[PDB]
Amino acid sequence: EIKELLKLGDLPTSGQIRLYDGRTGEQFERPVTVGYMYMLKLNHLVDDKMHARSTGSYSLVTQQPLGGKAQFGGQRFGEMEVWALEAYGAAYTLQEMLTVKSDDVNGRTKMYKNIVDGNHQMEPGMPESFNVLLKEIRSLGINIELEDE
């Protein structure tokens, strides 16, 4: 029936025709199937998924950046990517990704300050997420300390 309908419309039976390139303007080696197809515009837009965050809000209990485009949140650096980085051996990238990016209250501020001053120097710090863990374990009834030198 498709062949009969194409014959009725003065169209090739095989369903493919020769096209010429728009740039150079010569016929392609082989016939190319061209017809009309019903496309759909899906709800997964690109501007709804576009997002980026340099410095914004921080969570309250754990002092880490929030998540989600709606609240201008940072991307989640999961544990699989931490595994990937430590597989690479990039210890410094990991250190900044764990300390001066999210949970160093006096670390990220001075990293901001010295980046503005054009000095990309690193000043590590103790993550706040570890201090809350220490206080939580200590408040559970079991002593936890740090053996200083």
Partner: protein
């Protein structure tokens, strides 16, 4: 500031009051009219600090005029609000209460007190008394007491004895005990009785007593007397926008516990009846119990929303706890997300949207724009970037340049999921990704997202440029093959243009170079596929690094000549003079890498990418209905198959064939019809092109578009075309069985409703399996990466002894992987020598790169012993030489590289893809029998009388080509060392009948078989040649079952025929199901028989779990004569009688067929019973090399089934990490049989056998644990607590009082320091140098 270790122990009231800055007494939290916390409440200002920084509650002292004075009006010290996150508080409990962790986790006060948990629970619930002590002999310490007998004791004795109820009773019990007396008593009385059922429990009691003694933990501290409170900000009560409030459940739990504590305090001074005070004390115990762990002891306490309140142990454990959700994995700054689109881009570039770039780098523009002096202040710069003036872009284009940016695609299965690209600014909204890295990312352009991260510091940018750049990542860490292979369009273009046609255009014309070939093709005077003669100048580096040129005239196609302008002056023209499919392109890129280097490789990859895209576009390829040809024999085949379908149905209705045979026949005929259809379709599709050139007709390879994209391997396969055009084979219903009616139709012809419904079963099955089993795959990957944290190369050469043997995989059938690739990249352990004697190629260690592999395969070497990770003698790591060359680079691996993580990632990445009588010689060779007990049968041939013999095929060179298994009591048609060709049935044996063939010849008289007690008289009804029948225990009389019926060999005089050359008597014992063939009086010759005895992803994840198989194969750990003792008491017993050593009695199943008999001799580590082999037994009996080989082979089988290739060194590293614990049999420095890390035993004996001492150290035994047990049993509790069963490991650490040297990668990741890998290794070595010198 800087520290060394983390100390964990129990906390007594002393420093638990020291931490507190006050004591809470009021349940009130915050006022309702104002919102200032009340005095001594849960949010009090004095206890925890001011609500606003540098401001008291009143305001007498503010504005830093006073630094830290305490406002006398209220009592809050003027300071920051950050301190409010660290200030502690305590609650004084009226009655002591029991900690739940040391009560319910298995019991930790039950062991200490020796009393069962049931009695402790009964006492704690105020149900039964316990006698703390008794001055009389009638009562006894630690005796339970009901109320009636308690009153009887009270009226009998009164004050002489002492019993009590409640948690104070447990506290009194813990105070009464003295640890030294138990220490000196239990150890002294342990060695009198070797009762193994109690040896373990008394050993762990001794260990707990030692831990308490030398840990400084007084056991009274286990019972809580004063309870701390968490700082208020960690349990915040913050206002919401709509005037509401939000708080953690910890506020609820604290309010409950302090309300009940105050009520108890009030009740005590009221002299309330004892039942009400007991009820209140029990309520306090339950409230504190719920606070520490809600749903652990009783019913979980729910809030106003009917959901259980989470305790403060619920929020440090599990998936949602601080460890996994906030410490290991962390939200990050300077990051973005966008959809992924295709790139013309270079391999080291990514298309970054300009709109995202200004946001990501915003501080960088601020700083650069201040430096340029364009805006006076930073706020002015913020205004400029908010207006998006031209200057901000003029700053951006040079801010980003030479500043690499990471790209992440979740899930990051392996190390390649994170790569660094040099940004290029694009007008748009989507991330442009280079197509060559899509395969590594496992990303398609169907809506997938991408996470972008920008490194900040110089060290981070340098690391991204040096290690993370996509140019550096060429070969996968799993194995040496490249990972930038062109996927689908490039290969299609190259395959299309490296073709030939018989009479295309300008054929046979001779050209002077590839340049005029390209000009000819562009001008249209010559076709792209035309056999032409082209003068081609290729280069070769036969010289010592110098390139020599040879000019020759070759016949080829125009497209192949055009390719030659891309090859980088180091490769032969023969590499382009073929069809150039996917495999060809991959191998040609690999050769370009191995011969030239890295920069030519990346330039070449980019150039062939560009050419493939351009010529695929120039070609024009489409899929149409006419492209799917249909054989004219399809309907004929279908009708011919239905003919025998109908005939088989009529045979079934006749009744001469049952259901099973009919099923098998119809399945077979349908499969044959399907194969015929597929053959016809392939025949019509592969050479359908019939064309003529100056002749009659000539048939060439088809130019059909679908065949073009199937042959080149761009997309699809020959198996997809079968169901694209021919029938859609057979499918199975969910139960597993296969539907007999096939899908005779295809997708070109469409499907019936029934056929579609049938196919939907399989579609749904596969989709559900894919959606399900990759969760288990991810869990397995996490478990694997947990144990292999600490594997970092530390030395270059540990100087160890011999390593492990290496052999090809010739066993089973044809060779799968030869010795060429199983040893490529290894290091030898001895002076391995060529087949010619005294021809040595290695001085005990060398890198087996390609040249050495070629030299080895040129010789006839088949066994090489290489250095392995498991054999490495390095303490706390491995040495580089015991590992081998890196696979991502090809050179010897350098120190500091974390090998465990890459190993776990590499063997966990393919987890998703792996969701699911006679012997005939095949090739010419030498029939070789290894470990054979040869004997001659009655026909003069060679027969076998052992099970440890294997059939080997030895070629003219000497190396073994084929291996086969021959069972005991088989018949061979050929002798040993026979030069024969393939296609001959050499070995024959009955798969059901198992013979007891006698090795010697002599008279056979029936001895020790008395009828009516052990045997039954049964005669064959057709042949008449029959003898007495021996049955098993369940079928024979128990009267004669005491002695096994033995049929010894005698002579005319009546004496035993001994073994030729040995004085041991030769007699045969008859087990059950043994019917003697020959009669009495007649005899047999050598080799003749006396009696005839008739006979996935979890599949690999269980290997690392060290799961015990359901029916393990029981072996023997010592040689000697095997015998049997006790019979038919639950299960048969076995006796081992070695020549001089001891007796061995163990347990064997009599319902399982054995390998040896009463009169046979077996050796250590031999198979007596059949079944799967347990890895623990393999380690126990044979060496660690054997278990490593077994695990490696069994794992590699699963991957070879799915066609996934992984280097073997990635399995044996994890196996090495499995074998870290040891058990001690001797003594001298430790307990009698305590478990201990093997390296600790090595460093213990490193001086007891050195000059420091003659001999005191104890000998050990290797111990294998499962992957999870190995992960939890680590010297560092921080690594274990962040994995699984956090409560248990924290309780063990608390009681034992352990400390961590912070050696592992995960521990430093949690703390936030440099990981000890790569650069962090160079930092930690300096730290160790500083610490060593003080």
């Amino acid at each position: 500031e800087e520290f060394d270790a983390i100390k964990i122990a129990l906390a007594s009231p002393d420093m638990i009051r020291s931490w507190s800055f006050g004591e809470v007494k009021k349940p009130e939290t915050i006022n309702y009219r104002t919102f200032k916390p009340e005095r001594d409440g849960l949010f009090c200002a004095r206890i925890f600090g001011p609500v606003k920084d540098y401001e008291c509650l009143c305001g007498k002292y503010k504005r830093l005029k006073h630094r830290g004075v305490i406002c006398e009006k209220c009592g809050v010290e003027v300071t920051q609000t950050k301190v409010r996150r660290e200030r502690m508080g305590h609650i004084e409990l009226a009655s002591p209460t029991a900690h739940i962790w040391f009560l319910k986790s298995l019991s930790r006060i039950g062991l200490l007190l020796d009393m069962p948990l049931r009695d402790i629970e009964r006492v704690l619930y105020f149900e039964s008394y316990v006698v703390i002590e008794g001055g009389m002999t009638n009562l006894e310490r630690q005796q339970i007491l009901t109320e009636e007998q308690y009153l009887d004791a009270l009226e009998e004795f009164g004050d002489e004895f002492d019993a009590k109820m409640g948690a104070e009773a447990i506290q009194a019990l813990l105070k009464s005990m003295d640890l030294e007396q138990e220490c000196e008593q239990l150890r002294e009385e342990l060695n009198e009785t070797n009762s193994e059922t109690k040896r373990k429990k008394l050993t762990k009691r001794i260990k707990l007593l030692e831990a308490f003694v030398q840990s400084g933990n007084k056991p009274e501290w286990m019972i809580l007397t004063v309870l701390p409170v968490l700082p208020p900000d960690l349990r915040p009560l913050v206002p919401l926008d709509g005037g509401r409030f939000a708080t953690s459940d910890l506020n609820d739990l604290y309010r409950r516990v302090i309300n009940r504590n105050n009520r108890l305090k009030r009740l005590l001074d009221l002299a309330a009846p004892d039942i009400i005070v007991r009820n209140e004390k029990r309520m306090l115990q339950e409230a504190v119990d719920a606070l520490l762990d809600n749903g652990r002891r009783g019913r979980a306490i729910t809030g106003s929303n009917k959901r259980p309140l989470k305790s403060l142990a619920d929020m440090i454990k599990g998936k949602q706890g601080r460890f996994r959700q906030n410490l290991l994995g962390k939200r990050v700054d300077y990051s973005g997300r966008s959809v992924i689109t295709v790139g013309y881009l270079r391999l080291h570039q990514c298309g970054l949207p300009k709109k995202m770039a200004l946001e990501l780098f915003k501080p960088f523009i601020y700083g650069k724009l201040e430096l340029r002096g364009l805006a006076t202040t930073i706020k002015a710069a913020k205004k400029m970037v908010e207006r998006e003036e031209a200057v901000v872009w003029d700053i951006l284009d040079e801010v980003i340049r030479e500043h690499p940016v990471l790209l992440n695609r979740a899930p990051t299965l392996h190390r390649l999921g994170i790569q660094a690209f040099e940004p290029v600014l694009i007008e748009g909204k989507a991330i442009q990704l280079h197509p060559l890295v899509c395969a590594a990312y496992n990303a398609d352009f169907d809506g997938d997202q991408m996470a972008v991260h920008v490194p900040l510091t110089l060290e981070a940018q340098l690391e991204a440029r040096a290690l993370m750049m996509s140019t550096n990542n060429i070969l996968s860490p799993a194995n040496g093959e490249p990972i930038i292979v062109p996927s689908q369009d490039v290969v299609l273009g190259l395959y299309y243009m490296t073709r030939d046609c018989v009479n295309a255009k300008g054929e046979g014309m001779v050209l002077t170079g590839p340049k005029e070939a390209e000009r000819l093709y562009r001008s249209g005077l010559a076709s792209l596929h035309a056999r032409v003669k082209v003068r081609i100048t290729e280069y070769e580096k036969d010289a010592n690094g110098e390139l020599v040129a040879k000019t020759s005239l070759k016949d080829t196609t125009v497209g192949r000549a055009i390719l030659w302008m891309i090859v980088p002056k180091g490769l032969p023209y023969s590499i382009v003079n073929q069809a150039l499919g996917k495999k060809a392109i991959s191998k040609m890129l690999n050769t370009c890498y191995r011969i030239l280097g890295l920069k030519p490789t990346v330039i070449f990859a980019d150039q062939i990418m560009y050419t493939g895209f351009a010529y695929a576009a120039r070609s024009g390829a489409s899929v149409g209905i006419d492209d799917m040809v249909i054989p004219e024999k399809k309907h004929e085949i279908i009708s011919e198959a239905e003919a025998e379908v109908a005939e088989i149905q009529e045979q079934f209705q006749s009744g001469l064939v049952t259901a099973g045979e009919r099923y098998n026949k119809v399945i077979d005929i349908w499969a044959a019809a399907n194969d015929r259809v597929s053959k016809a379709m392939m025949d019509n599709l592969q050479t359908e092109t019939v064309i003529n050139r100056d002749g009659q007709e000539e048939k060439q390879v088809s130019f059909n578009s679908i065949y073009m994209m199937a042959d080149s391997g761009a997309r699809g396969s020959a198996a997809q075309i079968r169901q694209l055009a021919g029938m859609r084979g057979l499918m199975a219903k969910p139960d597993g069985s296969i539907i007999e009616t096939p899908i005779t139709a295809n997708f070109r012809e469409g499907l019936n409703v029934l056929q579609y419904f049938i196919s939907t079963h399989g579609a749904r099955k596969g989709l559900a399996d894919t959606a399900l089993k990759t969760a288990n795959s991810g869990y397995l990957t996490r478990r694997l990466v947990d144990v292999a944290q600490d594997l970092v190369v530390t030395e270059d050469d540990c100087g160890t002894h011999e390593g492990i043997m290496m052999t090809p995989v010739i066993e089973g059938g044809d060779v799968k992987e030869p010795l060429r690739d199983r040893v490529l990249g290894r290091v030898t352990a001895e002076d391995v020598l060529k087949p010619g004697t005294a021809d040595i190629l290695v001085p005990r260690n060398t890198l087996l790169h390609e040249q050495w592999c070629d030299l080895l395969e040129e010789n006839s070497v088949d066994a090489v012993k290489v250095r392995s990770v498991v054999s490495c003698d390095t303490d706390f790591g491995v040495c580089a030489h015991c590992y081998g060359r890196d696979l991502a680079r090809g050179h010897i691996i350098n120190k500091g590289e974390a090998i465990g993580v890459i190993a776990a990632q590499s063997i966990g990445e393919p987890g998703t893809q792996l969701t699911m009588s006679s012997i005939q010689v095949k090739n010419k060779g030498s029939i070789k029998l290894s470990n054979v007990k040869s004997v001659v049968n009655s026909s003069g041939k060679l027969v076998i009388t052992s099970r440890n013999t294997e059939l080997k095929l030895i070629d003219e060179f000497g190396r073994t080509k084929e291996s086969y298994k021959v069972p005991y009591g088989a018949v061979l048609a050929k002798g040993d060392g026979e030069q024969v060709a393939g296609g001959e049935t050499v070995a024959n044996w009955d798969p059901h009948t198992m013979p007891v063939i006698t090795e010697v010849s002599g008279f056979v008289r029936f001895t020790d078989m008395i009828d009516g007690q052990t045997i039954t008289r049964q005669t064959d009804e057709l042949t008449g040649l029959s003898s007495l029948v021996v049955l098993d225990s369940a079928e024979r009389t128990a009267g004669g079952k005491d002695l096994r019926p033995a049929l010894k060999i005698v002579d005319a005089q009546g004496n035993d025929v001994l073994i030729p050359g040995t004085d041991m008597p030769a007699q045969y014992f008859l087990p059950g199901k043994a019917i003697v063939q020959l009669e009495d009086g007649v005899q047999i010759s050598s080799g003749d028989t006396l009696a005839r005895i008739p006979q996935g992803l979890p599949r690999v994840a269980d290997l690392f779990e060290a799961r015990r198989p359901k029916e393990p194969a029981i072996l023997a750990e010592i040689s000697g004569i095997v015998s049997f003792g006790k019979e038919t008491k639950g299960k048969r017993r076995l006796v081992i009688t070695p020549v001089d050593g001891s007796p061995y009695e163990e347990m064997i199943p009599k319902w399982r067929q054995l390998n040896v008999f009463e009169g046979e001799r077996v050796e250590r580590g031999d198979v007596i019973s059949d079944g799967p082999e347990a890895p623990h037994d393999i380690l126990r009996l044979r060496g660690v090399h054997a278990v490593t080989r077994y695990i490696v082979n069994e794992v590699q089988d699963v991957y070879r089934l799915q066609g996934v290739k992984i280097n073997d060194k990635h399995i044996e590293v994890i196996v090495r990490q499995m074998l870290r614990k040891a058990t001690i049999v001797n003594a001298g420095s430790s307990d009698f049989l305590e478990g201990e890390q093997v390296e600790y035993s090595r460093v213990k004996i490193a001086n007891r056998e050195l000059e420091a001492n003659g001999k005191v150290g104890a000998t050990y035994s290797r111990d294998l644990l499962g992957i999870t047990k190995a992960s939890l049993a680590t010297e560092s509790f921080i690594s274990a607590a962040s994995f699984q069963e956090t409560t248990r490991v924290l309780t063990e650490a608390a009681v034992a009082g352990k400390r961590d040297e912070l050696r592992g990668l995960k521990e430093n990741v949690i703390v936030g320091r440099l990981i000890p890998a790569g650069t962090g290794y160079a930092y930690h070595q300096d730290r160790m140098r500083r610490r060593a010198a003080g």
